[PDB]
mmCIF file of C-alpha atoms in Angstrom:
data_model
loop_
_atom_site.group_PDB
_atom_site.id
_atom_site.type_symbol
_atom_site.label_atom_id
_atom_site.label_comp_id
_atom_site.label_asym_id
_atom_site.label_seq_id
_atom_site.Cartn_x
_atom_site.Cartn_y
_atom_site.Cartn_z
ATOM 1 C CA UNK A 1 21.390 -30.168 0.504
ATOM 2 C CA UNK A 2 21.301 -26.346 1.229
ATOM 3 C CA UNK A 3 18.687 -24.089 -0.672
ATOM 4 C CA UNK A 4 18.963 -20.272 -0.583
ATOM 5 C CA UNK A 5 16.283 -17.776 -0.249
ATOM 6 C CA UNK A 6 17.073 -14.478 -0.424
ATOM 7 C CA UNK A 7 15.616 -11.322 0.982
ATOM 8 C CA UNK A 8 15.400 -7.983 2.361
ATOM 9 C CA UNK A 9 13.447 -7.397 5.703
ATOM 10 C CA UNK A 10 15.210 -8.867 8.546
ATOM 11 C CA UNK A 11 12.067 -9.313 11.088
ATOM 12 C CA UNK A 12 10.757 -11.425 7.952
ATOM 13 C CA UNK A 13 13.896 -13.236 7.936
ATOM 14 C CA UNK A 14 13.900 -14.141 11.554
ATOM 15 C CA UNK A 15 10.351 -15.786 10.825
ATOM 16 C CA UNK A 16 11.617 -17.496 7.596
ATOM 17 C CA UNK A 17 14.012 -19.134 9.896
ATOM 18 C CA UNK A 18 11.227 -20.349 11.998
ATOM 19 C CA UNK A 19 9.383 -21.469 9.064
ATOM 20 C CA UNK A 20 12.257 -23.469 7.397
ATOM 21 C CA UNK A 21 13.247 -24.901 10.657
ATOM 22 C CA UNK A 22 9.893 -27.111 10.505
ATOM 23 C CA UNK A 23 10.146 -27.449 6.670
ATOM 24 C CA UNK A 24 13.637 -29.539 7.437
ATOM 25 C CA UNK A 25 12.113 -31.470 10.164
ATOM 26 C CA UNK A 26 9.236 -32.720 7.887
ATOM 27 C CA UNK A 27 11.644 -32.628 4.813
ATOM 28 C CA UNK A 28 15.131 -33.683 6.482
ATOM 29 C CA UNK A 29 17.176 -34.023 2.650
ATOM 30 C CA UNK A 30 17.017 -30.184 2.879
ATOM 31 C CA UNK A 31 18.914 -27.801 4.658
ATOM 32 C CA UNK A 32 17.291 -23.853 3.615
ATOM 33 C CA UNK A 33 19.304 -20.726 4.231
ATOM 34 C CA UNK A 34 18.566 -16.889 4.399
ATOM 35 C CA UNK A 35 20.369 -14.438 2.841
ATOM 36 C CA UNK A 36 19.874 -10.581 3.792
ATOM 37 C CA UNK A 37 20.777 -7.810 1.538
ATOM 38 C CA UNK A 38 19.340 -4.036 2.554
ATOM 39 C CA UNK A 39 16.812 -3.079 0.312
ATOM 40 C CA UNK A 40 18.664 0.282 -0.936
ATOM 41 C CA UNK A 41 20.986 -1.870 -3.324
ATOM 42 C CA UNK A 42 18.854 -5.582 -3.347
ATOM 43 C CA UNK A 43 17.885 -5.375 -7.213
ATOM 44 C CA UNK A 44 21.162 -3.411 -8.187
ATOM 45 C CA UNK A 45 22.693 -6.437 -6.399
ATOM 46 C CA UNK A 46 20.267 -9.017 -7.745
ATOM 47 C CA UNK A 47 20.338 -7.850 -11.409
ATOM 48 C CA UNK A 48 24.597 -8.631 -11.436
ATOM 49 C CA UNK A 49 24.484 -12.227 -9.496
ATOM 50 C CA UNK A 50 21.323 -13.344 -11.777
ATOM 51 C CA UNK A 51 23.415 -12.011 -14.875
ATOM 52 C CA UNK A 52 26.556 -14.101 -13.836
ATOM 53 C CA UNK A 53 25.184 -17.520 -12.582
ATOM 54 C CA UNK A 54 25.481 -16.527 -8.875
ATOM 55 C CA UNK A 55 21.882 -15.520 -7.404
ATOM 56 C CA UNK A 56 20.602 -17.477 -4.745
ATOM 57 C CA UNK A 57 18.428 -20.421 -5.412
ATOM 58 C CA UNK A 58 14.985 -18.627 -4.521
ATOM 59 C CA UNK A 59 14.653 -15.130 -4.314
ATOM 60 C CA UNK A 60 12.521 -12.260 -3.627
ATOM 61 C CA UNK A 61 11.170 -9.898 -6.393
ATOM 62 C CA UNK A 62 8.633 -6.912 -6.493
ATOM 63 C CA UNK A 63 6.311 -6.054 -9.540
ATOM 64 C CA UNK A 64 8.138 -3.330 -10.572
ATOM 65 C CA UNK A 65 11.032 -5.747 -11.704
ATOM 66 C CA UNK A 66 10.454 -8.913 -12.310
ATOM 67 C CA UNK A 67 9.323 -8.656 -15.947
ATOM 68 C CA UNK A 68 13.074 -8.324 -17.003
ATOM 69 C CA UNK A 69 13.534 -11.632 -15.456
ATOM 70 C CA UNK A 70 10.669 -13.542 -16.309
ATOM 71 C CA UNK A 71 11.173 -12.549 -19.747
ATOM 72 C CA UNK A 72 15.103 -13.225 -20.583
ATOM 73 C CA UNK A 73 14.551 -17.114 -18.414
ATOM 74 C CA UNK A 74 15.659 -16.640 -15.220
ATOM 75 C CA UNK A 75 12.955 -17.761 -13.104
ATOM 76 C CA UNK A 76 11.125 -21.109 -12.721
ATOM 77 C CA UNK A 77 7.381 -20.883 -14.038
ATOM 78 C CA UNK A 78 4.868 -21.484 -10.821
ATOM 79 C CA UNK A 79 2.566 -24.630 -12.295
ATOM 80 C CA UNK A 80 0.694 -25.280 -9.293
ATOM 81 C CA UNK A 81 -2.373 -24.017 -7.680
ATOM 82 C CA UNK A 82 -3.332 -20.515 -7.292
ATOM 83 C CA UNK A 83 -6.823 -20.768 -5.334
ATOM 84 C CA UNK A 84 -5.188 -20.249 -2.002
ATOM 85 C CA UNK A 85 -2.870 -16.909 -3.092
ATOM 86 C CA UNK A 86 -4.177 -13.246 -3.005
ATOM 87 C CA UNK A 87 -5.614 -12.447 -6.358
ATOM 88 C CA UNK A 88 -4.001 -9.230 -5.914
ATOM 89 C CA UNK A 89 -0.436 -10.729 -5.598
ATOM 90 C CA UNK A 90 -1.250 -13.469 -8.393
ATOM 91 C CA UNK A 91 -2.047 -10.877 -10.946
ATOM 92 C CA UNK A 92 0.651 -8.534 -9.692
ATOM 93 C CA UNK A 93 3.610 -11.296 -10.786
ATOM 94 C CA UNK A 94 1.767 -13.194 -13.890
ATOM 95 C CA UNK A 95 3.165 -12.413 -17.505
ATOM 96 C CA UNK A 96 2.774 -14.230 -20.927
ATOM 97 C CA UNK A 97 0.037 -15.917 -19.170
ATOM 98 C CA UNK A 98 2.469 -17.643 -16.502
ATOM 99 C CA UNK A 99 2.958 -17.008 -12.634
ATOM 100 C CA UNK A 100 6.408 -16.335 -11.944
ATOM 101 C CA UNK A 101 6.816 -16.190 -8.136
ATOM 102 C CA UNK A 102 5.040 -18.154 -5.056
ATOM 103 C CA UNK A 103 3.230 -15.186 -3.564
ATOM 104 C CA UNK A 104 4.240 -14.149 0.023
ATOM 105 C CA UNK A 105 3.407 -10.866 1.318
ATOM 106 C CA UNK A 106 1.114 -8.530 0.180
ATOM 107 C CA UNK A 107 0.579 -4.833 1.559
ATOM 108 C CA UNK A 108 -3.450 -5.199 1.353
ATOM 109 C CA UNK A 109 -5.567 -2.576 0.759
ATOM 110 C CA UNK A 110 -5.841 1.578 1.528
ATOM 111 C CA UNK A 111 -8.525 2.008 4.100
ATOM 112 C CA UNK A 112 -9.894 4.668 6.682
ATOM 113 C CA UNK A 113 -8.982 4.802 10.328
ATOM 114 C CA UNK A 114 -11.863 6.913 12.229
ATOM 115 C CA UNK A 115 -11.479 8.223 15.723
ATOM 116 C CA UNK A 116 -14.736 6.764 17.023
ATOM 117 C CA UNK A 117 -15.217 9.624 20.304
ATOM 118 C CA UNK A 118 -15.240 12.546 17.004
ATOM 119 C CA UNK A 119 -17.372 10.538 14.818
ATOM 120 C CA UNK A 120 -20.175 10.356 18.156
ATOM 121 C CA UNK A 121 -19.752 14.228 19.104
ATOM 122 C CA UNK A 122 -21.027 15.245 15.552
ATOM 123 C CA UNK A 123 -23.330 12.178 15.086
ATOM 124 C CA UNK A 124 -21.970 9.540 13.110
ATOM 125 C CA UNK A 125 -22.283 6.146 13.633
ATOM 126 C CA UNK A 126 -19.368 4.189 12.271
ATOM 127 C CA UNK A 127 -21.303 1.951 9.651
ATOM 128 C CA UNK A 128 -21.941 5.182 7.703
ATOM 129 C CA UNK A 129 -18.374 5.519 7.241
ATOM 130 C CA UNK A 130 -18.320 2.138 5.043
ATOM 131 C CA UNK A 131 -21.025 3.917 2.506
ATOM 132 C CA UNK A 132 -19.213 7.173 1.719
ATOM 133 C CA UNK A 133 -18.402 8.235 -2.076
ATOM 134 C CA UNK A 134 -16.545 10.890 -3.550
ATOM 135 C CA UNK A 135 -17.416 12.500 -7.269
ATOM 136 C CA UNK A 136 -17.126 15.780 -8.813
ATOM 137 C CA UNK A 137 -21.113 15.671 -9.622
ATOM 138 C CA UNK A 138 -23.530 15.989 -6.885
ATOM 139 C CA UNK A 139 -23.969 12.147 -6.288
ATOM 140 C CA UNK A 140 -21.236 13.064 -3.593
ATOM 141 C CA UNK A 141 -21.277 11.912 -0.148
ATOM 142 C CA UNK A 142 -17.681 12.283 1.143
ATOM 143 C CA UNK A 143 -17.618 16.403 1.439
ATOM 144 C CA UNK A 144 -20.459 17.070 3.223
ATOM 145 C CA UNK A 145 -19.456 14.361 5.693
ATOM 146 C CA UNK A 146 -15.888 15.681 5.984
ATOM 147 C CA UNK A 147 -17.598 19.257 6.579
ATOM 148 C CA UNK A 148 -19.805 17.748 9.573
ATOM 149 C CA UNK A 149 -16.547 16.639 10.589
ATOM 150 C CA UNK A 150 -14.164 19.172 10.847
ATOM 151 C CA UNK A 151 -14.415 21.926 13.624
ATOM 152 C CA UNK A 152 -12.698 25.143 14.284
ATOM 153 C CA UNK A 153 -11.619 27.250 17.844
ATOM 154 C CA UNK A 154 -15.543 28.091 18.071
ATOM 155 C CA UNK A 155 -17.427 25.009 17.343
ATOM 156 C CA UNK A 156 -18.038 25.912 13.706
ATOM 157 C CA UNK A 157 -18.151 23.280 11.301
ATOM 158 C CA UNK A 158 -16.720 23.898 8.198
ATOM 159 C CA UNK A 159 -19.983 23.906 6.006
ATOM 160 C CA UNK A 160 -20.758 26.892 8.640
ATOM 161 C CA UNK A 161 -20.900 30.491 7.714
ATOM 162 C CA UNK A 162 -18.243 32.052 9.739
ATOM 163 C CA UNK A 163 -16.224 29.205 9.847
ATOM 164 C CA UNK A 164 -12.508 30.130 10.054
ATOM 165 C CA UNK A 165 -10.034 27.831 8.099
ATOM 166 C CA UNK A 166 -7.124 29.998 10.379
ATOM 167 C CA UNK A 167 -8.106 28.293 13.542
ATOM 168 C CA UNK A 168 -9.246 24.510 12.561
ATOM 169 C CA UNK A 169 -8.873 22.610 15.671
ATOM 170 C CA UNK A 170 -10.302 19.437 13.997
ATOM 171 C CA UNK A 171 -9.412 17.737 10.672
ATOM 172 C CA UNK A 172 -11.965 15.481 8.938
ATOM 173 C CA UNK A 173 -9.672 14.244 6.693
ATOM 174 C CA UNK A 174 -5.797 13.860 5.734
ATOM 175 C CA UNK A 175 -6.407 14.570 1.752
ATOM 176 C CA UNK A 176 -2.513 15.032 0.600
ATOM 177 C CA UNK A 177 0.306 14.869 -1.805
ATOM 178 C CA UNK A 178 0.946 11.388 -0.430
ATOM 179 C CA UNK A 179 0.700 8.896 -3.299
ATOM 180 C CA UNK A 180 0.318 5.405 -1.223
ATOM 181 C CA UNK A 181 -2.968 6.965 1.288
ATOM 182 C CA UNK A 182 -4.378 9.072 -1.131
ATOM 183 C CA UNK A 183 -4.072 10.058 -4.728
ATOM 184 C CA UNK A 184 -2.860 7.006 -5.703
ATOM 185 C CA UNK A 185 -6.793 5.472 -4.624
ATOM 186 C CA UNK A 186 -8.179 8.618 -6.127
ATOM 187 C CA UNK A 187 -6.294 7.974 -9.430
ATOM 188 C CA UNK A 188 -7.850 4.466 -9.481
ATOM 189 C CA UNK A 189 -10.802 5.167 -8.445
ATOM 190 C CA UNK A 190 -11.556 7.380 -11.165
ATOM 191 C CA UNK A 191 -10.179 5.084 -13.838
ATOM 192 C CA UNK A 192 -7.053 6.636 -14.919
ATOM 193 C CA UNK A 193 -3.377 5.380 -14.343
ATOM 194 C CA UNK A 194 -0.062 7.097 -12.768
ATOM 195 C CA UNK A 195 2.139 4.652 -14.558
ATOM 196 C CA UNK A 196 2.431 2.058 -17.587
ATOM 197 C CA UNK A 197 5.198 0.790 -19.626
ATOM 198 C CA UNK A 198 7.499 1.912 -17.264
ATOM 199 C CA UNK A 199 6.849 5.378 -17.838
ATOM 200 C CA UNK A 200 4.768 8.227 -15.957
ATOM 201 C CA UNK A 201 1.033 8.979 -17.189
ATOM 202 C CA UNK A 202 -0.577 10.470 -14.883
ATOM 203 C CA UNK A 203 -1.757 13.157 -17.086
ATOM 204 C CA UNK A 204 -4.986 11.784 -18.273
ATOM 205 C CA UNK A 205 -9.016 12.524 -17.665
ATOM 206 C CA UNK A 206 -9.392 10.258 -14.642
ATOM 207 C CA UNK A 207 -6.101 11.656 -12.649
ATOM 208 C CA UNK A 208 -7.300 15.341 -13.568
ATOM 209 C CA UNK A 209 -10.461 13.899 -12.039
ATOM 210 C CA UNK A 210 -8.827 12.903 -8.661
ATOM 211 C CA UNK A 211 -6.216 15.659 -8.355
ATOM 212 C CA UNK A 212 -8.846 18.585 -9.079
ATOM 213 C CA UNK A 213 -11.319 16.952 -6.239
ATOM 214 C CA UNK A 214 -8.537 16.343 -3.529
ATOM 215 C CA UNK A 215 -7.530 20.433 -4.338
ATOM 216 C CA UNK A 216 -10.652 21.277 -3.501
ATOM 217 C CA UNK A 217 -10.783 19.224 -0.351
ATOM 218 C CA UNK A 218 -7.681 21.146 0.543
ATOM 219 C CA UNK A 219 -7.990 24.622 -0.197
ATOM 220 C CA UNK A 220 -11.628 25.004 -0.984
ATOM 221 C CA UNK A 221 -13.034 23.287 1.853
ATOM 222 C CA UNK A 222 -10.511 23.286 4.227
ATOM 223 C CA UNK A 223 -11.571 19.922 5.214
ATOM 224 C CA UNK A 224 -7.878 18.319 5.038
ATOM 225 C CA UNK A 225 -4.857 20.206 6.339
ATOM 226 C CA UNK A 226 -3.154 22.754 4.402
ATOM 227 C CA UNK A 227 -0.769 21.375 1.663
ATOM 228 C CA UNK A 228 1.841 23.518 3.400
ATOM 229 C CA UNK A 229 1.752 21.174 6.526
ATOM 230 C CA UNK A 230 1.523 17.853 4.289
ATOM 231 C CA UNK A 231 4.058 18.240 1.493
ATOM 232 C CA UNK A 232 7.412 16.714 2.957
ATOM 233 C CA UNK A 233 5.947 16.232 6.079
ATOM 234 C CA UNK A 234 4.280 12.080 5.313
ATOM 235 C CA UNK A 235 4.054 11.937 8.911
ATOM 236 C CA UNK A 236 2.276 15.100 10.000
ATOM 237 C CA UNK A 237 -1.510 13.869 9.620
ATOM 238 C CA UNK A 238 -0.927 10.388 11.484
ATOM 239 C CA UNK A 239 0.496 12.520 14.168
ATOM 240 C CA UNK A 240 -2.979 15.002 14.217
ATOM 241 C CA UNK A 241 -5.008 11.319 14.374
ATOM 242 C CA UNK A 242 -2.914 10.766 17.210
ATOM 243 C CA UNK A 243 -3.447 13.841 18.864
ATOM 244 C CA UNK A 244 -7.114 13.654 18.468
ATOM 245 C CA UNK A 245 -7.275 15.965 16.179
ATOM 246 C CA UNK A 246 -8.447 13.974 12.983
ATOM 247 C CA UNK A 247 -11.895 12.513 12.324
ATOM 248 C CA UNK A 248 -10.779 10.241 9.703
ATOM 249 C CA UNK A 249 -7.568 9.554 8.727
ATOM 250 C CA UNK A 250 -7.155 7.202 5.326
ATOM 251 C CA UNK A 251 -4.226 5.025 5.100
ATOM 252 C CA UNK A 252 -2.622 1.649 5.120
ATOM 253 C CA UNK A 253 -2.053 -1.305 7.472
ATOM 254 C CA UNK A 254 1.555 0.246 7.750
ATOM 255 C CA UNK A 255 -0.335 2.868 10.493
ATOM 256 C CA UNK A 256 -1.263 -0.077 12.547
ATOM 257 C CA UNK A 257 1.241 -0.494 14.278
ATOM 258 C CA UNK A 258 1.983 3.142 14.764
ATOM 259 C CA UNK A 259 -1.611 3.629 15.429
ATOM 260 C CA UNK A 260 -2.550 0.974 18.183
ATOM 261 C CA UNK A 261 0.928 1.677 20.138
ATOM 262 C CA UNK A 262 -0.384 5.603 21.272
ATOM 263 C CA UNK A 263 -4.336 5.887 20.659
ATOM 264 C CA UNK A 264 -5.950 7.065 23.642
ATOM 265 C CA UNK A 265 -9.573 7.455 21.986
ATOM 266 C CA UNK A 266 -11.694 4.540 20.592
ATOM 267 C CA UNK A 267 -11.035 3.778 17.122
ATOM 268 C CA UNK A 268 -11.507 1.363 14.138
ATOM 269 C CA UNK A 269 -11.236 1.114 10.666
ATOM 270 C CA UNK A 270 -13.913 1.718 7.672
ATOM 271 C CA UNK A 271 -13.813 1.069 3.681
ATOM 272 C CA UNK A 272 -12.051 3.039 1.408
ATOM 273 C CA UNK A 273 -14.493 5.620 -0.275
ATOM 274 C CA UNK A 274 -15.786 4.921 -3.517
ATOM 275 C CA UNK A 275 -15.104 6.960 -6.436
ATOM 276 C CA UNK A 276 -16.407 6.994 -10.223
ATOM 277 C CA UNK A 277 -14.978 3.754 -10.860
ATOM 278 C CA UNK A 278 -15.652 2.268 -7.425
ATOM 279 C CA UNK A 279 -13.419 1.301 -4.881
ATOM 280 C CA UNK A 280 -10.359 1.108 -6.168
ATOM 281 C CA UNK A 281 -7.191 0.485 -3.515
ATOM 282 C CA UNK A 282 -3.333 0.817 -4.399
ATOM 283 C CA UNK A 283 -2.057 -2.359 -3.727
ATOM 284 C CA UNK A 284 1.530 -4.323 -3.557
ATOM 285 C CA UNK A 285 3.011 -7.539 -3.258
ATOM 286 C CA UNK A 286 6.105 -9.655 -2.548
ATOM 287 C CA UNK A 287 6.818 -12.937 -4.559
ATOM 288 C CA UNK A 288 9.319 -15.446 -4.310
ATOM 289 C CA UNK A 289 11.014 -16.359 -7.578
ATOM 290 C CA UNK A 290 12.593 -20.210 -8.046
ATOM 291 C CA UNK A 291 15.976 -19.632 -9.765
ATOM 292 C CA UNK A 292 16.200 -21.296 -13.271
ATOM 293 C CA UNK A 293 19.883 -21.691 -12.920
ATOM 294 C CA UNK A 294 20.068 -23.485 -9.731
ATOM 295 C CA UNK A 295 21.796 -26.441 -9.120
ATOM 296 C CA UNK A 296 19.233 -28.605 -7.488
ATOM 297 C CA UNK A 297 15.762 -27.506 -9.526
ATOM 298 C CA UNK A 298 14.186 -30.422 -7.305
ATOM 299 C CA UNK A 299 14.683 -29.001 -4.276
ATOM 300 C CA UNK A 300 13.925 -25.817 -4.932
ATOM 301 C CA UNK A 301 10.375 -26.635 -5.998
ATOM 302 C CA UNK A 302 10.317 -28.238 -2.307
ATOM 303 C CA UNK A 303 10.776 -25.103 -0.485
ATOM 304 C CA UNK A 304 8.755 -23.196 -3.080
ATOM 305 C CA UNK A 305 5.666 -25.514 -2.312
ATOM 306 C CA UNK A 306 6.353 -25.252 1.456
ATOM 307 C CA UNK A 307 6.874 -21.272 1.205
ATOM 308 C CA UNK A 308 3.097 -20.952 -0.706
ATOM 309 C CA UNK A 309 1.455 -23.412 2.034
ATOM 310 C CA UNK A 310 -0.666 -22.678 4.821
ATOM 311 C CA UNK A 311 1.799 -23.929 7.356
ATOM 312 C CA UNK A 312 4.811 -22.238 6.212
ATOM 313 C CA UNK A 313 3.241 -18.770 5.227
ATOM 314 C CA UNK A 314 1.647 -18.300 8.634
ATOM 315 C CA UNK A 315 5.027 -17.566 10.174
ATOM 316 C CA UNK A 316 5.377 -14.425 8.141
ATOM 317 C CA UNK A 317 2.274 -12.959 9.850
ATOM 318 C CA UNK A 318 2.537 -14.760 13.464
ATOM 319 C CA UNK A 319 3.974 -11.436 14.460
ATOM 320 C CA UNK A 320 1.220 -9.166 13.072
ATOM 321 C CA UNK A 321 3.672 -6.799 10.772
ATOM 322 C CA UNK A 322 3.634 -8.738 7.493
ATOM 323 C CA UNK A 323 0.461 -9.850 6.082
ATOM 324 C CA UNK A 324 0.833 -13.329 4.918
ATOM 325 C CA UNK A 325 -0.004 -13.731 0.557
ATOM 326 C CA UNK A 326 -1.081 -17.423 1.054
ATOM 327 C CA UNK A 327 -5.687 -16.917 1.868
ATOM 328 C CA UNK A 328 -5.404 -19.933 4.470
ATOM 329 C CA UNK A 329 -2.497 -18.453 6.694
ATOM 330 C CA UNK A 330 -3.805 -14.469 6.629
ATOM 331 C CA UNK A 331 -6.180 -15.591 9.924
ATOM 332 C CA UNK A 332 -2.848 -15.494 12.237
ATOM 333 C CA UNK A 333 -3.060 -11.483 10.823
ATOM 334 C CA UNK A 334 -6.568 -11.265 11.872
ATOM 335 C CA UNK A 335 -6.284 -12.852 15.079
ATOM 336 C CA UNK A 336 -3.509 -11.101 15.992
ATOM 337 C CA UNK A 337 -5.192 -7.967 15.770
ATOM 338 C CA UNK A 338 -8.645 -8.887 16.691
ATOM 339 C CA UNK A 339 -7.027 -10.000 20.228
ATOM 340 C CA UNK A 340 -5.782 -6.496 20.411
ATOM 341 C CA UNK A 341 -9.253 -4.958 19.542
ATOM 342 C CA UNK A 342 -9.174 -4.281 15.891
ATOM 343 C CA UNK A 343 -10.777 -5.493 13.027
ATOM 344 C CA UNK A 344 -8.775 -5.554 10.070
ATOM 345 C CA UNK A 345 -11.168 -6.960 6.800
ATOM 346 C CA UNK A 346 -11.551 -3.590 5.228
ATOM 347 C CA UNK A 347 -7.849 -3.150 4.129
ATOM 348 C CA UNK A 348 -8.838 -6.977 2.595
ATOM 349 C CA UNK A 349 -12.477 -6.746 1.562
ATOM 350 C CA UNK A 350 -11.641 -3.990 -0.486
ATOM 351 C CA UNK A 351 -9.041 -5.893 -3.014
ATOM 352 C CA UNK A 352 -12.000 -7.808 -3.913
ATOM 353 C CA UNK A 353 -12.590 -5.541 -6.624
ATOM 354 C CA UNK A 354 -10.790 -3.669 -9.374
ATOM 355 C CA UNK A 355 -6.878 -2.226 -8.347
ATOM 356 C CA UNK A 356 -4.109 0.129 -9.253
ATOM 357 C CA UNK A 357 -0.446 -1.472 -8.699
ATOM 358 C CA UNK A 358 2.099 0.416 -6.754
ATOM 359 C CA UNK A 359 4.288 1.574 -9.163
ATOM 360 C CA UNK A 360 7.973 1.088 -9.172
ATOM 361 C CA UNK A 361 10.859 0.084 -11.403
ATOM 362 C CA UNK A 362 14.360 1.713 -13.219
ATOM 363 C CA UNK A 363 14.222 5.251 -12.711
ATOM 364 C CA UNK A 364 11.074 5.484 -10.658
ATOM 365 C CA UNK A 365 12.662 7.211 -7.567
ATOM 366 C CA UNK A 366 14.141 9.703 -9.649
ATOM 367 C CA UNK A 367 11.147 10.450 -12.006
ATOM 368 C CA UNK A 368 9.074 10.705 -8.009
ATOM 369 C CA UNK A 369 11.430 13.138 -7.091
ATOM 370 C CA UNK A 370 11.057 15.269 -10.325
ATOM 371 C CA UNK A 371 7.528 15.667 -10.079
ATOM 372 C CA UNK A 372 7.543 16.245 -6.205
ATOM 373 C CA UNK A 373 8.090 20.435 -6.610
ATOM 374 C CA UNK A 374 5.117 20.131 -9.596
ATOM 375 C CA UNK A 375 2.820 18.480 -7.132
ATOM 376 C CA UNK A 376 3.625 20.783 -4.223
ATOM 377 C CA UNK A 377 2.460 23.444 -5.962
ATOM 378 C CA UNK A 378 -0.328 21.466 -7.228
ATOM 379 C CA UNK A 379 -1.683 20.785 -3.967
ATOM 380 C CA UNK A 380 -0.924 24.527 -3.046
ATOM 381 C CA UNK A 381 -3.806 25.253 -5.390
ATOM 382 C CA UNK A 382 -1.524 27.363 -7.327
ATOM 383 C CA UNK A 383 -1.965 27.384 -10.846
ATOM 384 C CA UNK A 384 -4.463 24.533 -13.039
ATOM 385 C CA UNK A 385 -4.209 20.980 -12.532
ATOM 386 C CA UNK A 386 -3.980 20.451 -15.982
ATOM 387 C CA UNK A 387 -1.131 22.433 -16.867
ATOM 388 C CA UNK A 388 0.606 20.993 -13.557
ATOM 389 C CA UNK A 389 0.125 17.227 -14.626
ATOM 390 C CA UNK A 390 1.229 17.892 -18.002
ATOM 391 C CA UNK A 391 4.899 19.780 -17.157
ATOM 392 C CA UNK A 392 5.184 17.029 -14.071
ATOM 393 C CA UNK A 393 4.889 14.318 -16.597
ATOM 394 C CA UNK A 394 7.216 15.355 -19.056
ATOM 395 C CA UNK A 395 9.536 15.904 -15.841
ATOM 396 C CA UNK A 396 9.714 12.704 -14.606
ATOM 397 C CA UNK A 397 10.029 11.267 -17.333
ATOM 398 C CA UNK A 398 13.073 13.305 -18.548
ATOM 399 C CA UNK A 399 14.452 12.450 -14.889
ATOM 400 C CA UNK A 400 13.818 8.359 -15.415
#
């Protein structure tokens, strides 16, 4: 009996092959085969295959797309215990009171890389960075911390008279037109939404609050790089962090590999700052769904059970590049990194409260491209956040 597993990441396909070889040794009635399809056309192809009965037994879904499949009965109900799976990914795949996929991988949450040498030089202990709060009111603690951490070529900090924003040598932070690392967390941390019911919905009080704050950090405080540096250069801030030029660099686990490889100074990871509604990180996960039209539904059930076990899911995290969604399997990931001198807890701890889903779905790419020029102007400090969001929303939706 052959069960086929469909997915889109190659290194993970390698890890699956190692996982399923271990499965078949304890369950030799079943051979599992992986089937790579490139990310760029995965969903358009899965849509055709599912629709006409030739999709694989097991396939990867994201949050963006599973809904259409779940409603039309394409997907098996995941009828197991869920206490050992990331709650974030579990919620991501629950619809009408049913779990529709076995959680496989998670992004985890956003955190704050810091350059400890640059903290030491400014008189800041790394623990201080874990208790920061952003706000439009006078309960804010982020801004003065970023100000202390932003230095011009004369040694004048951002809050000092004389400070020259043209001559900044060291930025405190990476506030920028950068959804995943920055503004999606600000919106959620303000109680706003970015997307609702497959439509862009960021024209709302919370998002207004978030964008005013960010606009201010960049154009008025000068504690993050100018928007011309970062609008359409997604890597600018990370490169400045690597060059020893940025105190705090707010990002996800995707920057762990690029940071560990090249960073020559002492560094760590601290918590996401809290907003008016707490520390709310963007997150996103991947689940493996069972095909309801599978020729061998029992064997699929055995394979899904293994994929969701400590032992099976451990394989995806053993290389420290993808994070297991099984909670008991995640120490393979922590260990990978602790041995390389990095504590990864803040990326995980942040999930322990409320969250915002990574936006996605049909017509999203096109919508995201359409809002882009308006967001660029907004981060350039031009016009008004209010008027910009209203026009950007109408434009994003039209394109969708």
